[PDB]
Design a protein around this ligand. Structure first.
Ligand SMILES: [Mg+2]
Ligand SMILES: [Mg+2]
Ligand SMILES: [Mg+2]
Ligand SMILES: [Mg+2]
Ligand SMILES: [Mg+2]
Ligand SMILES: [Mg+2]
Ligand SMILES: [Mg+2]
Ligand SMILES: [Mg+2]
Ligand SMILES: [Mg+2]
Ligand SMILES: [Mg+2]
Ligand SMILES: [Mg+2]
Lengths: 247, 247, 247, 247, 247, 247
């Protein structure tokens, strides 16, 4: 496949062109024209890049690439190491940020719901679906469940959360700021990846169970999902590598 | 003391005028004129408020108040309950954000340094001081040190940091975004309150020990220090109340 | 350093040659001659092996390697996957079994003692040290201490143990069979890693507190200290990786 | 019945003499010639023995008796108390080990298959049957079924096992070393009583669900079934006593 | 000692005369005047009486004797066999009920707290002391702790109890009716011997852990302690005998 | 149906006013007048009440209601929660105690006998029927059969009962005090729900097999049968709900 054909293929599968974002979606750094072996992971860290070079990948696809709004375009320190590892080896880098969080099937938000056992039912706002657990359980049990399914112990705050959690809303990664919107919609628990100082007061004062189950942990689902989608719908050789990040 | 007097007293001790901020610094909600019993804390949470009410406080002073830039001005949910507890009881709410982060004597950044045994020596950027531990220790020992001093286990990332940590930079609260700037300046360790997904790659790729010691935990120092200053320089009856927040 | 050189350095520090074993101690699978980066772990599993590859290790060092007496020589299944990862990448695999259980300073046994707060005072038999807890406590209290220090709830049988445990014998890993020898010597508790059906009768009928604290959990001690020893005594770059194992 | 007659009766029903074992099968300790009341249990522990004395038994029959190969012959400590209790009271001790594991009808392996709802279909190796659950289920439901049926929560490692378990191999007691042969055979799960450190690597790297269901827990079926068969086929009064053992 | 002397001596030690009871406390069935050898136990069942005869005792002392309020006076069945064994052999039968449950030193309630490691701190109601575990633990562990100290697995209902148990109330024997009084006083656990249908709802709806640890299991303590007290304070020969009872 | 009419219908089918009881039989807490949907169960616990609320029930009928003789009338803790749920939602509570144990067709005693396979042949006293198993069996087998039909392992004491059980007497619930009455009449076994310390002695000394099969497990039959009887003879929608209770 040509690198530009692959950009167009996933752009169309994820209705990318239609979504405003904090960074460029699609081909971020151009490499050789022909793409046959693909390495993907949550973030284009130096460590993922090093696996793509070790594996002889032609392209790398991630949910967090470079060139974020507000960033300095200067190329030094980390940025110089990353771009040189890509450019010298002719590796194509693609990033799909909000389109891969939102897709109904392959997105981070839909995959978390499948992994945690939540029946999606509607959407509170663009990146915040809500639904119900198919097996309603107490706040403590839900924490252990999230810990067993993502393999990471979440920050659980449920000082004033309901006795049993049924209705839930969530947003993967750094979606702590949607907690009020979810509490205002009416839920039993709100789940996200990161947490901030104010997030705790929102859970306490609004009567809900809150979980920060990890930015990286809650965001392996979509890129892994898109990687499967590529292996089943093309002849590409796509390998998804989960490189652990505590955050 | 009069409410407007107290405002001008603390505004001048913290050179507040000369500091751009994300929210109004000073008297945020006007209550009775005469102030004598003051309750303070890290954030004007409903819980700190109900303590002010139980203690028959005339004013509450915090580091995190209301009216953050970009916030919806409508008064509903939590803002209604909070503002009603203050206006109905004639309690003055005062808040100081960045000026209480930076003051060289009473600020959260100077009080963390005192607490962890760091000799301040310069400033990399306005909210980010640098200095040297008085007793250099290996990354593991500094993590245990931070946890004993703050009473909270920090997230520590030292995959690629020096054998012994001597030079340190820091920013209390959510200053994770200052990590690359500390890296370019040159430090063995960077400490702040919260953590983001990109912060972990900044720690590994630039070879430094990183600690996320908690937003609330790294921010009890300054408003506690200011409360002492008030009890020591005025006849005001000030009680600092620490309400645990895991974030 | 030269792979054969690193083999002689550790053999001599651990007095390996003078100790008969169930498997070869030293370089078990040869790789590239020049070793500078090493990854270590309790067991040369496929998981550790994959982390060694990913981090560009030239050698892997473990407490449990391959070629155990009685095992079939044929290379198939897990053996084939494991040997290939090592051989295709020129990675040296070394292992030290009994020699790393027993070394007075760096061994598994002496390191468990320091972690648990036991003053070593002697040995009942070659892999069975004896000593006393610096702070004597009841059986139940000791169970929570071992759980807190090792990060794993131990199986505790104390149906007939003394009211306070002071004198203790122990043997990391699969040493449940040394319990009768410990009882005849005279101790209040026996601690090991695994448990067997007969172990519980031994505990009960001989009046001691028995603890099965984890084969893996009790054997991260030696390999991690041996890794600290190499970083402090050579210029090799050694990283210990703990890959959790329930047993 | 005459003590030696009962020996011969059970030796024949179980085809004992044709199975090489690690300890003597049959009458291990002679007692009064005339047998009428018999107490049975998993292991000839001091507790079962004291029970047989209290009930006035003339014999005891167990799965685990004495005299294992390589054990010291000397009679001291536990052996002295156990042998004294039997000899002073003229109580006959019988033990059948591998024969009582294997009998197609009354054996521990067949009894466990019946308890867990597994249709026996063949034999992988002598002590390791295989079959299919009459009701296939995911690995978590099976952990719960085993825990419900055995009365003990098993250790369940299934991080890489199939979504639904149907084909199963098992060996009661200490059969962990048989897991690799079951993998080669091709099964979705392997169940045994104990666990060892290498067993967890075998489950993960070969993709199967593994369960250490308890050594004593998985071995009550056989001696209990034998006890039932004697009450149905002789005029003997045989009682089975389950004396709890968590291993 | 004269039988009437021994009665007077235990009455005063236990402050018996000043306690209303459901049966006569003291000498219930008179026998020979001179008492030298005494056998004791929880209940004057036929099995106990029979040991008294075999052992040639002059007297038997229990916690549960005869003549309970409400009982038929007619002497037939069990009562005839029991009374014949005592009268024909001239054996004295003494029984102390509530006095032996309540004595602060020798009573069933004080002996259970010492067996279980509880520091007695006061009394909720006449037969229900309250106290704190010197080693607080979760409800599951306390269950295992009760099992091991008593030698019998208790029924543990802890669906809604606290995460850690510290304050506890108890009443040996059939004291399940006191669970609501304990819940009203404020406790993390209530322990007794028997259980009733309603006892479970009290536990669940009042948020405490409940344990039915055995009527007989929890009442060996008092009569055994009075037995050691007689042996230490007189020249009598008293043997306490535990005859197992499941309830 | 009108609430006072339903009361009447069941009072007459169970000949209730004729039976004197420990609590009022019939409508115990009046609710809305029109009843159409009804939830039933063994005891009016908070848990059944909350189900009745979830399900929109107009009435709840149980075997155990409130207002037992001797109980305090005050409404607090548990009674307040329960009564508030009923009264605030206008749910009628009806309860029938002894008339629901005794009815020849629908009662707990007759329904247990149909379940267990016993032909009822007459009665010893009011709540204690007697009969014979259609298939006589040893007491061990009877234990296993009771466990299979009721779903709970019973306590079986058969130390001294007949080799085979044929004639049986039984009382569901707390009927242990009837065991001496069954023995004098002449039976092989006596079956009830709960057990008490003295019941074990009655069993041993009177030579009968005794089974405590569970107060809750033996009392589902009646209210379940009454609920079917209401669905078949009225237009009411009745749902019997089993809320497990181990006692
Ligand atoms: Mg995202
Ligand atoms: Mg801040
Ligand atoms: Mg700040
Ligand atoms: Mg080992
Ligand atoms: Mg070892
Ligand atoms: Mg075995
Ligand atoms: Mg076996
Ligand atoms: Mg009693
Ligand atoms: Mg009592
Ligand atoms: Mg009843
Ligand atoms: Mg009843």
């Amino acid at each position: 496949m040509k690198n530009t054909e692959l950009e167009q293929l996933i752009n169309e599968k994820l209705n990318s062109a239609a979504i405003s974002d904090y960074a460029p979606n699609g081909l971020q750094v151009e490499g050789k024209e022909t793409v046959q072996k693909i390495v993907t992971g949550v973030t284009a860290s130096q460590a993922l890049l090093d696996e793509a070079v070790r594996l002889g990948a032609d392209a790398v696809i991630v949910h967090h690439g470079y060139f974020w709004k507000g960033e300095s375009p200067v190329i030094r320190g980390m940025k110089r190491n990353r771009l040189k590892t890509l450019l010298a080896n002719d590796i194509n880098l693609y990033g799909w940020h909000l389109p891969l969080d939102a897709h109904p099937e392959l997105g981070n938000n839909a995959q978390l719901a499948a992994l945690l056992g939540i029946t999606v039912m509607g959407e509170i706002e663009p990146l915040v679906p809500w639904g119900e657990l198919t097996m309603p359980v107490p706040g403590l049990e839900l924490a252990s469940w999230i810990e067993a399914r993502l393999g990471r112990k979440p920050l659980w705050c449920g000082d004033t959360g309901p006795e049993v959690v049924q209705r839930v809303a969530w947003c993967t990664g750094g979606g702590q700021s949607f907690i009020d919107s979810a509490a205002r919609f009416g839920v039993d628990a709100f789940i996200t990846g990161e947490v901030s100082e104010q997030t705790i007061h929102s859970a306490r004062e609004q009567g809900l169970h809150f979980y920060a189950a990890g930015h990286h942990a809650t965001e392996r689902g979509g890129i892994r999902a898109l990687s499967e989608w590529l292996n089943e719908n093309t002849d590409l050789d796509v390998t998804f590598i989960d490189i652990p990040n505590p955050a």
